[PDB]
Amino acid sequence: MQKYIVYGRRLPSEKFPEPEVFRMTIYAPNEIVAKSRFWYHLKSLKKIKRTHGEILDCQHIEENGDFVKNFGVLLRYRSRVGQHNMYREVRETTSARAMDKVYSEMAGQCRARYHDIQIINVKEVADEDVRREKVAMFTQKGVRFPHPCPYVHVKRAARTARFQDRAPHV
Amino acid sequence: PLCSSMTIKVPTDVECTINKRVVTVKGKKGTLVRDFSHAPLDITHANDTISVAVWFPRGKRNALPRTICSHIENMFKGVTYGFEYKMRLAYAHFPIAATVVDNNKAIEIRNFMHQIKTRRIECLPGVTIAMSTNVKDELILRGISIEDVSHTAARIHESLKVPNKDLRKFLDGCYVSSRGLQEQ
Amino acid sequence: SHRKFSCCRKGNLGYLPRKRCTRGRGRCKTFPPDVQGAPIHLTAFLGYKAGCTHVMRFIDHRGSNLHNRQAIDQATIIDAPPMICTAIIGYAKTPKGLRAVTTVWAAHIAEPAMRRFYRNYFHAEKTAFSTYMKKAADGTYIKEQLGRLKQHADVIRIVAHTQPALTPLKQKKADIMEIQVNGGANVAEKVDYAYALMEKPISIKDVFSVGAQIDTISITRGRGFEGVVTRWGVTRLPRKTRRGNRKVACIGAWHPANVQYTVARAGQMG
Amino acid sequence: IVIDCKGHILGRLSAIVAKELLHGHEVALVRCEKAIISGAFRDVKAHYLKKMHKRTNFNHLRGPFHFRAPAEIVRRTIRGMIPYKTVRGSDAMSRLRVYDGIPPCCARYKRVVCPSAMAYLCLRPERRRCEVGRVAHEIGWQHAADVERYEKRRLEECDKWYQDKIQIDKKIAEAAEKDAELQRINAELAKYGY
Amino acid sequence: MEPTLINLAREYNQNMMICRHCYARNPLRATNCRRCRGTNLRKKKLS
Amino acid sequence: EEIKGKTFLPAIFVGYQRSRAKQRENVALVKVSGIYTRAETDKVLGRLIAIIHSKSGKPIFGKICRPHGNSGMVRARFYTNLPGQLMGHKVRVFYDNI
Amino acid sequence: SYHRFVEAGRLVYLGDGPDKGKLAVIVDILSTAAVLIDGPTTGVKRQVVSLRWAMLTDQVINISEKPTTEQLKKEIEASPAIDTFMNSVWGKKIQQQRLRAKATFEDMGKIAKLRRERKMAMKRIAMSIK
RNA sequence: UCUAAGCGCGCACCCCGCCUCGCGCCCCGCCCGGCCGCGCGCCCCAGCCCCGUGCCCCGUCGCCGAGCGGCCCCCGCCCGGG
RNA sequence: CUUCGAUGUCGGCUCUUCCUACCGUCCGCGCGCACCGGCGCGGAAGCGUCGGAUUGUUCACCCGUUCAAGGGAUCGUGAGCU
RNA sequence: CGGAACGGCGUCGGCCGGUCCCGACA
């Protein structure tokens, strides 16, 4: 939900007075979880355990979200059988906002929680490049569709104590 | 914005009216009304075509537009040419005698397998039964509605059922031979 | 464990509760169906069982051993002294169930029917129907009320009372019975027919025919408190049984803990 | 409160009705034959036939009672949702009347509908629903024909009464220009908006 | 019996497919039995 | 009485504040007509309320204190704790000060 | 399914959310579930709102594709759509409903007394018209 | 292509009738009285035909009458025979 | 694990109820289903599943008939009996 | 919806290829 660029390096050593710096773009609810994910990765990808290294900077990158763009997410999730690879495309205003839509549709359909899924990459794809039809139909210049749920105006009836004189039309 | 839509074209002879999801179709052979309100469809007239358009076709709702288009067009065919479902009585040793009885409103089948039980099958309203003099031992069912003719015909075939035995060896009954849009 | 052998339960549980009958006399309950448009007819009568005779009849059942042969068969003579119509009752078909619109009683009620309304007629007040007779006796009250039945009533029945003086019975008071007018072309025709018989005797010969089948409703002979063997047809136990052989040995299993309605028990047999 | 049960889910409305009865609201439910039970009829009949199987083995008379009439089925549903052995709840069951059709003077009472508990809004098209009246004919009710024949008569009479009401209402509205105008000006224009 | 009439009758009675479990009659070209729901085993037997 | 022409807003005593385990017969849960959200209760908070004793016929006064839930129901305390035979009975929240 | 279609420029009366009671325009459609709505003259800051919170209105404003917020405001101002909708039956009720929301307990007391005068008056008017 | 919409037929099973009981209620007769209440469009939801309101004061000033509804009321034994 | 200041322990006899994992009858369907008769399978517990010789027997075994499924209820059933 | 090996053209979502305007005997 946030989007952070966590920078980190192993603690300086006599053999390596200057160690290599790693940068990771991590989407997470909070800075504390973002720094845990960064170290979950560096522990496996670069053999740098959290106690071995240090986080130079966790930097929240806020985004301007005034226009809808198609964000494609490649990820790996561990199911009841085992790890699988999946590419999901979501059209959303900001990359953090589309990561929320991806993790909402990964828990609902694939039953994978945030810590099971690891995101390989997030990259904005143009209308021509969309490979998924659920996102493609919206990308076309003009979309006219009836209101999908016009019966959802039953929020009005909870207030009414459900004692309306006539049955409301939709 | 997904909407599985199938459009047919209304025949000029037929005059078609749609109110809600109930379609009333009248041509030369007579008016047929069918109600498709069980299904959620955007039946749209105007021009000379009917578009069915089921919006948000998530699951088996994609099946609905073709089915309804076919049904409206089966109705348009019947109100013009009419549907005939010729049925041929088949017997080995026992001549089976079918006699049209209530002024083309019922059939009485006797001497089936030398069975004392006489079977009368009434037709669904608006379907006439006759015996094709030309084909011989054949019964021609003619009506505007395809499903009334077909229901009338399958009741005919369901009454004439050999009680046990091997159905593969003992084939005797009324079997629909020709199902077609022809001759009322 | 399994019962080990196959036997049917003794007795019909439909006829439970096997209690003395609380209705005053056998009551018709369901009347035959209307079949509107039939010849207008009355559906029932009250009679008193007189005895049995035995008749020799010629049988014409085809494909029977007794075809074209003579058969001695038992007969029951029911004395049926003429009943007299005393009222017209109309019942609407309501979503609750048949609901009585009204009973328009006769201008004059006979002493036999009137003696039913009191426990001891000689010492009684004799107040029943006193105002009603004055309200009627012009025919206006009977006809205006009868019209209400035509508009609302869907079922028309007639109250009729037996003549016990024409019977060798010691009753004196007369049984009142509702007999349904049936098979009318319309309810108004039923009311018109019903008024034709008002205050007038109806005979068993008019109500039924020879060869027709009738069903007789009555209260059975009483046998008093009776044990399981007579009341329910259970097998008497072996002679060696202590505390007697005329008993249902096992009234049930340990579980269900309570005794069940299905098990046979001693009580009224008639 | 008189609520038409036509088009209403059985459980969803019963829950509103139960809270009202416990809050002392004196409710009457009419047209209970036209209330809806969700699910395919075959399965709702099996569920309503399975309930009638459970009867006290020793004396069926002392055991659960299964009511064929739809109005009685609706009352038993609300009873499950009400503390009926307690006095607060037996006094709530007492203030409830369930009717099939609008029969005595329930017809002349003003009637209301609970929109949220109504089937159209509550269940998706293609859910499959049945009316309590047909489930009750199949479990034993014998008066379905009776409450149809009667309801037809009431609806015919209501149409005649409506046309009579329509002309009178035009005069009633036309005559509403007296101090009603002053109240209207000082109720809505006084910015209350009512 | 006429041979032409025999063919029509046998199409109704003999031509078919039978699931090996449901035993259900199935269409001449089938991949799954309707009643046995997807049983992929089916046959039919000539007299 | 003390209250004769007081305009009032209909309310209902819907039972004492409770848990399945314990009843706090000190506080009384009141559903006010026209209050459907916790935020709306603010208007009717601290206002005078009264329930008419069924036996006495004389009002028992009280004040609305804090909102019970998200549904607009409020918790109220009266000079004497209510009897419990007054559950479902109507309480009156007076528009005027006393 | 026949009129009132989710589309670019459709005026929407928000019925849930922080913007409850405020009109807006559907600038883009993210999906079936959500739309991007902006109300430059109506006080809604551009945000993505689930279509459930947006009741559709008959008026559709004429907007360019991707019209920003300032360009949307010039286009929204140019259209007579907002003004006609407030002259509508729904718009007339929305104005009355807005006044009803800002009512204190003292205001409510005056309202309920006035309502009683109408209830009694109607009986007096309808007793004359028998 | 028997199914997904839709439709037809369909088991000594099931449910109901018939039957056994039956709390209550009803009509009637005697009697003819008391008490209480005040309030109706219908249909449809993929036309929803213009919606997305209303009521929001059952004492809070409302209670006349009429009508449409409800409710209460009322109905002996001993003794003898079956 | 519960019961030893005691839950009467086998079988029969009697009588009730239940289960289905169905033997016959019902309804389908498949056969290496010509008929006749078998055999398999799905729904189906309404009814039937008996009379005897030997054994305390449950069981077993044989005879017979209108040809004869398997079980549960404190191994149902002892202030019911034997 | 205690529960398995196993089945499911029930419905959404993937993963990896082939045929694809060289429109998937003519």
Coordinates of N, CA and C in Angstrom, one line a residue, chain C residues 186-261:
Chain C
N186 N -77.0 -24.7 -9.8 CA -76.4 -23.4 -9.2 C -76.9 -23.4 -7.7
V187 N -76.2 -22.7 -6.9 CA -76.6 -22.6 -5.4 C -78.0 -22.1 -5.2
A188 N -78.5 -21.1 -6.0 CA -79.8 -20.6 -5.9 C -80.8 -21.8 -6.2
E189 N -80.5 -22.6 -7.1 CA -81.4 -23.8 -7.4 C -81.4 -24.7 -6.1
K190 N -80.2 -24.8 -5.5 CA -80.1 -25.7 -4.3 C -81.0 -25.1 -3.2
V191 N -81.0 -23.7 -3.0 CA -81.8 -23.1 -2.0 C -83.3 -23.2 -2.3
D192 N -83.7 -23.1 -3.6 CA -85.1 -23.2 -4.0 C -85.5 -24.7 -3.8
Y193 N -84.7 -25.6 -4.1 CA -85.1 -27.1 -3.8 C -85.2 -27.2 -2.3
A194 N -84.3 -26.6 -1.5 CA -84.2 -26.8 -0.1 C -85.5 -26.2 0.6
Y195 N -86.1 -25.2 -0.1 CA -87.2 -24.5 0.6 C -88.4 -25.3 0.2
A196 N -88.4 -26.0 -0.9 CA -89.5 -26.9 -1.3 C -89.7 -28.0 -0.2
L197 N -88.6 -28.5 0.4 CA -88.8 -29.6 1.3 C -88.9 -29.1 2.7
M198 N -88.9 -27.7 2.9 CA -88.9 -27.2 4.3 C -90.2 -27.5 5.0
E199 N -90.2 -28.0 6.2 CA -91.4 -28.4 7.0 C -92.0 -29.6 6.4
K200 N -91.4 -30.3 5.5 CA -92.0 -31.5 4.8 C -91.1 -32.7 5.0
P201 N -91.7 -33.9 5.2 CA -91.0 -35.1 5.4 C -90.2 -35.6 4.1
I202 N -89.0 -36.2 4.3 CA -88.2 -36.7 3.2 C -88.0 -38.2 3.5
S203 N -88.1 -39.0 2.4 CA -88.2 -40.5 2.6 C -86.8 -41.1 2.2
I204 N -86.4 -42.2 2.8 CA -85.2 -42.9 2.4 C -85.3 -43.3 0.9
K205 N -86.5 -43.7 0.5 CA -86.7 -44.1 -0.9 C -86.4 -42.9 -1.9
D206 N -86.7 -41.7 -1.5 CA -86.3 -40.5 -2.3 C -84.7 -40.3 -2.3
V207 N -84.1 -40.4 -1.1 CA -82.6 -40.1 -1.0 C -81.7 -41.2 -1.7
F208 N -82.0 -42.5 -1.6 CA -81.1 -43.5 -2.2 C -81.8 -44.4 -3.2
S209 N -81.1 -45.3 -3.9 CA -81.8 -46.2 -4.8 C -81.3 -47.7 -4.6
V210 N -82.0 -48.7 -5.1 CA -81.5 -50.1 -5.0 C -80.3 -50.3 -5.9
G211 N -79.3 -51.0 -5.4 CA -78.1 -51.3 -6.1 C -77.0 -50.2 -5.9
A212 N -77.4 -49.1 -5.3 CA -76.4 -48.0 -5.0 C -75.6 -48.5 -3.8
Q213 N -74.4 -47.9 -3.7 CA -73.6 -48.3 -2.5 C -73.6 -47.1 -1.5
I214 N -73.8 -47.4 -0.3 CA -73.9 -46.4 0.8 C -72.8 -46.7 1.8
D215 N -72.4 -45.7 2.6 CA -71.4 -46.1 3.6 C -72.1 -45.8 5.0
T216 N -72.1 -46.7 5.9 CA -72.9 -46.5 7.1 C -72.0 -46.0 8.2
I217 N -72.3 -44.9 8.9 CA -71.5 -44.3 9.9 C -72.2 -44.5 11.3
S218 N -71.6 -45.1 12.3 CA -72.3 -45.4 13.5 C -71.3 -45.6 14.7
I219 N -71.7 -45.7 15.9 CA -70.8 -46.0 17.1 C -70.9 -47.5 17.3
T220 N -69.7 -48.2 17.4 CA -69.7 -49.6 17.6 C -70.2 -50.1 19.0
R221 N -70.5 -51.4 19.0 CA -70.9 -52.0 20.3 C -69.8 -51.8 21.4
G222 N -70.2 -51.5 22.6 CA -69.1 -51.3 23.6 C -68.8 -52.6 24.3
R223 N -67.5 -52.8 24.7 CA -67.1 -54.0 25.4 C -66.5 -53.6 26.8
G224 N -66.5 -52.4 27.1 CA -66.0 -51.9 28.4 C -64.4 -51.9 28.4
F225 N -63.8 -51.8 29.6 CA -62.4 -51.9 29.7 C -62.0 -53.3 29.3
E226 N -61.0 -53.4 28.4 CA -60.6 -54.7 27.8 C -59.1 -54.8 27.7
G227 N -58.6 -55.9 27.9 CA -57.1 -56.1 27.9 C -56.5 -56.1 26.5
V228 N -55.2 -56.3 26.4 CA -54.4 -56.2 25.2 C -54.9 -57.4 24.2
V229 N -55.2 -58.6 24.8 CA -55.5 -59.7 23.8 C -56.8 -59.3 23.0
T230 N -57.9 -59.0 23.7 CA -59.1 -58.6 23.0 C -59.0 -57.3 22.3
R231 N -58.5 -56.3 22.9 CA -58.5 -54.9 22.4 C -57.5 -54.8 21.2
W232 N -56.4 -55.5 21.2 CA -55.4 -55.3 20.1 C -54.9 -56.5 19.4
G233 N -55.5 -57.7 19.7 CA -55.1 -58.9 19.0 C -53.7 -59.4 19.3
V234 N -53.1 -59.2 20.4 CA -51.8 -59.7 20.8 C -51.9 -61.2 21.1
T235 N -50.8 -62.0 20.9 CA -50.8 -63.4 21.3 C -50.8 -63.6 22.8
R236 N -51.6 -64.5 23.3 CA -51.6 -64.8 24.7 C -50.3 -65.5 25.0
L237 N -49.6 -65.3 26.1 CA -48.3 -65.8 26.4 C -48.4 -67.3 26.9
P238 N -47.3 -68.1 27.1 CA -47.4 -69.5 27.5 C -48.1 -69.6 28.9
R239 N -48.6 -70.8 29.1 CA -49.4 -71.0 30.4 C -48.5 -70.7 31.6
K240 N -47.3 -71.0 31.6 CA -46.4 -70.9 32.8 C -46.1 -69.5 33.2
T241 N -46.5 -68.5 32.4 CA -46.1 -67.1 32.7 C -46.8 -66.8 34.1
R242 N -45.9 -66.2 35.0 CA -46.4 -65.8 36.4 C -47.1 -64.4 36.2
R243 N -48.1 -64.1 36.9 CA -48.9 -62.9 36.8 C -49.7 -62.9 35.5
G244 N -50.0 -64.1 35.0 CA -50.9 -64.2 33.8 C -50.3 -64.2 32.5
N245 N -51.1 -64.8 31.5 CA -50.6 -65.0 30.1 C -51.3 -63.9 29.2
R246 N -52.4 -63.3 29.7 CA -53.0 -62.3 28.8 C -52.4 -60.9 28.9
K247 N -51.2 -60.8 28.4 CA -50.4 -59.5 28.5 C -49.4 -59.3 27.4
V248 N -49.1 -58.0 27.1 CA -48.0 -57.7 26.2 C -46.8 -57.8 27.1
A249 N -45.8 -58.7 26.8 CA -44.7 -58.9 27.8 C -43.8 -57.7 27.8
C250 N -43.4 -57.2 26.7 CA -42.4 -56.2 26.7 C -43.0 -54.9 26.1
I251 N -43.2 -53.9 27.0 CA -43.8 -52.6 26.6 C -42.8 -51.7 26.0
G252 N -41.6 -52.1 25.7 CA -40.6 -51.3 25.0 C -39.1 -51.6 25.4
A253 N -38.2 -50.9 24.7 CA -36.7 -51.1 25.0 C -36.3 -50.2 26.2
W254 N -35.1 -50.4 26.7 CA -34.6 -49.4 27.7 C -34.6 -48.0 27.1
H255 N -34.2 -47.9 25.8 CA -34.3 -46.5 25.2 C -35.1 -46.8 23.9
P256 N -36.1 -45.9 23.5 CA -36.7 -44.8 24.2 C -37.2 -45.1 25.6
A257 N -36.8 -44.2 26.6 CA -37.1 -44.5 28.0 C -38.6 -44.5 28.2
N258 N -39.3 -43.6 27.6 CA -40.8 -43.5 27.8 C -41.5 -44.7 27.0
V259 N -42.7 -45.1 27.5 CA -43.4 -46.1 26.7 C -44.0 -45.4 25.5
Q260 N -44.2 -46.1 24.4 CA -44.6 -45.4 23.1 C -46.1 -45.7 22.8
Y261 N -46.7 -44.8 22.0 CA -48.1 -44.9 21.6 C -48.3 -46.2 20.8

